[PDB]
Design a protein around this nucleic acid. Structure first.
Length: 50
DNA sequence: GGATGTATATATCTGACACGTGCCTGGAGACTAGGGAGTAATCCCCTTGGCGGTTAAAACGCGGGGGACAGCGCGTACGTG
């Protein structure tokens, strides 16, 4: 479910939702396919996701 | 009996407001052309994540000595009347 919601947030870009509870909130959505591969691998690759 | 402090009434200042007037500059309406929005193609530059190898620059430790800083004197230059 976490992988699915991260894929939905990246593919339909949701910077406000991708920030969410992060204090810094420094999310880079350049190289969309790289972030999609990271979401397909593990959600813990993203910052403030564990 | 003379002199003194307070209270309401009228004339004058003083900025603000109602009215008047010109006039000119902004607004209403119509028309047009062109500037900018949108589309497609092509090619070069940038992004994020990796790798390998060189090597010169960065980091760390330590001695020491040069310089920052504190204290004291003095005399003169500036404050003060």
């Amino acid at each position: 479910d976490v992988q699915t919601e991260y894929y939905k947030n990246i593919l339909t870009k949701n910077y406000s939702a991708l920030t969410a509870g992060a204090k810094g909130g420094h999310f880079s959505l350049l190289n969309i396919m790289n972030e999609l591969k990271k979401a397909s691998n593990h959600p813990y690759l993203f910052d403030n996701a564990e």
